[PDB]
Write a protein that binds this ligand. Structure first.
Ligand SMILES: C[C@H](CCC(=O)NCC(=O)O)[C@H]1CC[C@H]2[C@@H]3[C@H](O)C[C@@H]4C[C@H](O)CC[C@]4(C)[C@H]3C[C@H](O)[C@]12C
Ligand SMILES: C[C@H](CCC(=O)NCC(=O)O)[C@H]1CC[C@H]2[C@@H]3[C@H](O)C[C@@H]4C[C@H](O)CC[C@]4(C)[C@H]3C[C@H](O)[C@]12C
Ligand SMILES: C[C@H](CCC(=O)O)[C@H]1CC[C@H]2[C@@H]3[C@H](O)C[C@@H]4C[C@H](O)CC[C@]4(C)[C@H]3C[C@H](O)[C@]12C
Lengths: 323, 327
């Protein structure tokens, strides 16, 4: 997985979902008055309305990622081994399951400051959704229009990091991911000077020599570095459309194609979908592995009602045939 | 630039065009009876029909890349400094300009073997199209459904290489690009075993460790290696449509986004367009930097037309909007 933010004409947030199969994920809109029930806390009957991507099981929206009506985003990314969920409930904490974590935060908080304050009081508890959908290790990027934070709950406790670059992938932990960037300081967007030695006439026969050293594989660390370099140096767009276009190009730099990353089961890991949320305009844009054309759906300020509203992903290549 | 081939349910050929501006590119169909004029040779009034991408200037199709009615393709890629075009005309060879080279080959040749025999005997001459559109050094990938060759005309002469992998970018010369792959034999699609040392317990905390060492920058050598690794290992598709989808994913691994590659002029080099020709079905599919939706145009047999048929590129993001906003 790779999740990024982007600040331009509007403000954006989104992710690649990398996996060896599709869950049958879809757009899910949770209306303000859909009752959020929690396994160990009091139900929230009236909350901020959400739009996001995930599956519906037992009439409950299991979000992979989502934004709310205030333009606060949240995405769960794989964090295998490092994620620790506690078996013990705490009287002085809000005892919340990892699958309830997106509704808990996005239902109640309008920005990152309010998200941080609420995450500070949390205890992520080890209870699965069902026997069919057991818990997996996750960590979270939470982002609004100004900034973002990373939430990683491990054996040592609940860690919240300011994310200065708006990038997140998978393992290792976030301080290791940020430290890993330091050795790439010498990378450049331009042709560098010959600092190797002035006593040899080193020739440049092509553009893009500045980037030499940037890792190209699809391991989580290499994708963290490549996404950071691509995002931070990406050119500013003139419009919101140019920003969204540029956003999908940035996610395309760390996309996983079928064939290059075979898992232990022998299945091919690939970028199942890519999405971009316009946070100021409350609009989800997305693409799938099977369809390059961007699909858009706006969360409109309507008192929607009671029930989950879904728009299924269409996994067929929509080609404009000119004949 | 990166040009690749792919063999799946059908057989494919295509490229990324990497540049710091757009020429106003368009689909150009040249019918069989469009008279190809040549600066230093006799005009050809009847030939094979082409479909490809480029610009029209003075009613002449200036192809960036194209295919013909037999599914033979040809693409010109940037080859700065290494290309040598002759300043002298030969009395016993066809004196053809670089901008005439795609029509010269694709107009007359049905497969790679015929293209090679014609390329062997050519004299590429140092003549510009016009003052507005001067020559720049190129090298070519020529591909059919079976195989592909690389043409590099340098000071040492006309060099034709069998391309065993169906990959081409820019400098260096092709033997250097192919030799450069040898150091990456250790790369893998799966989590490798700890051969570093069994005296230390090295942990794997994520997928994709096998690829570590694959270069990720947009220099021509790094794109040559990354495109080769991505193309050769890419999964087989069930249908032709899945192959095309997969083809655009392969070109996307070596795409240049605006901002990461600042040229000498200070402008940003970017993938202006990507295309995929279905060679068996003679159909051009393409995308642009500004538009993610694939656009398709088929070459139809039309043995009597003598005028170029053109479809300009849409440089606007065509989004499938499910509902309207309230602004
Ligand atoms: C060749 C065409 C003119 C004929 C034509 O329009 N053919 C395509 C068609 O008919 O669709 C012209 C029109 C605009 C020109 C471009 C613009 O002036 C901008 C820019 C100016 C530079 O001096 C040289 C490169 C170029 C991209 C120009 C190259 C070329 O000089 C262009 C692209
Ligand atoms: C993307 C590169 C850019 C090459 C360049 O100018 N490099 C200078 C450099 O790197 O120093 C190539 C690929 C196909 C080329 C075009 C095609 O061959 C068709 C046509 C051929 C004419 O001889 C010159 C103009 C042009 C439009 C060419 C302009 C330009 O030549 C193109 C678009
Ligand atoms: C597996 C996948 C990505 C990581 C990877 O490559 O393993 C992760 C990221 C978000 C996850 C899903 C979301 O967190 C929503 C659900 C949460 C439930 O606790 C498990 C099922 C559930 C439906 C998850 C399945 C799976 O673990 C997802 C889809």
């Amino acid at each position: 997985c790779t999740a990024i933010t982007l600040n331009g004409n509007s403000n954006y947030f989104g992710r690649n979902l990398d996996l060896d199969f599709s869950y049958g994920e879809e757009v899910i809109i949770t209306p303000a008055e859909y009752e959020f029930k929690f396994r160990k806390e009091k139900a929230i009957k009236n909350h901020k309305s959400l739009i996001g991507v995930g599956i519906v099981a037992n009439d409950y929206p299991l979000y992979f990622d989502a934004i709310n009506e205030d333009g606060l985003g949240m995405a769960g990314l794989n964090f295998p081994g490092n994620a620790y969920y506690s078996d013990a409930l705490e009287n002085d904490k809000d005892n919340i399951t990892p699958f309830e974590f997106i509704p808990w935060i996005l239902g109640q908080c309008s920005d990152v400051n309010e998200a941080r304050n609420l995450v500070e009081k949390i205890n992520l508890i080890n209870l699965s959704f069902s026997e069919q959908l057991p818990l997996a290790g996750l960590h979270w990027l939470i982002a609004d229009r100004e900034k973002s934070i990373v939430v990683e709950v491990t054996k040592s406790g609940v860690h919240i990091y300011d994310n200065p670059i708006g990038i997140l992938t998978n393992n290792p932990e976030f301080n290791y991911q940020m430290y890993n960037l330091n050795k790439y300081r010498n990378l450049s967007i331009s042709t560098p000077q010959n600092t190797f030695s002035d006593s040899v006439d080193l020739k440049v026969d092509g553009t893009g020599f500045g980037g030499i050293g940037l890792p190209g594989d699809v391991s989580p660390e290499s994708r963290f570095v490549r996404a950071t370099f691509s995002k931070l140096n990406s050119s500013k767009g003139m419009t919101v459309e140019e920003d969204i276009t540029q956003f999908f190009h940035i996610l395309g730099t760390v996309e996983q194609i079928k064939g290059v990353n075979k898992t232990e089961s022998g299945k091919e890991e690939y970028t199942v979908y890519s999405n971009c949320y316009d946070l100021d305009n409350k609009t989800l844009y997305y693409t799938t592995y099977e369809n390059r054309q961007i699909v858009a759906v706006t969360l409109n300020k309507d008192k929607d009602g009671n029930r989950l509203v879904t728009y299924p992903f269409e996994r067929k290549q929509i080609i404009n045939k000119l004949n």
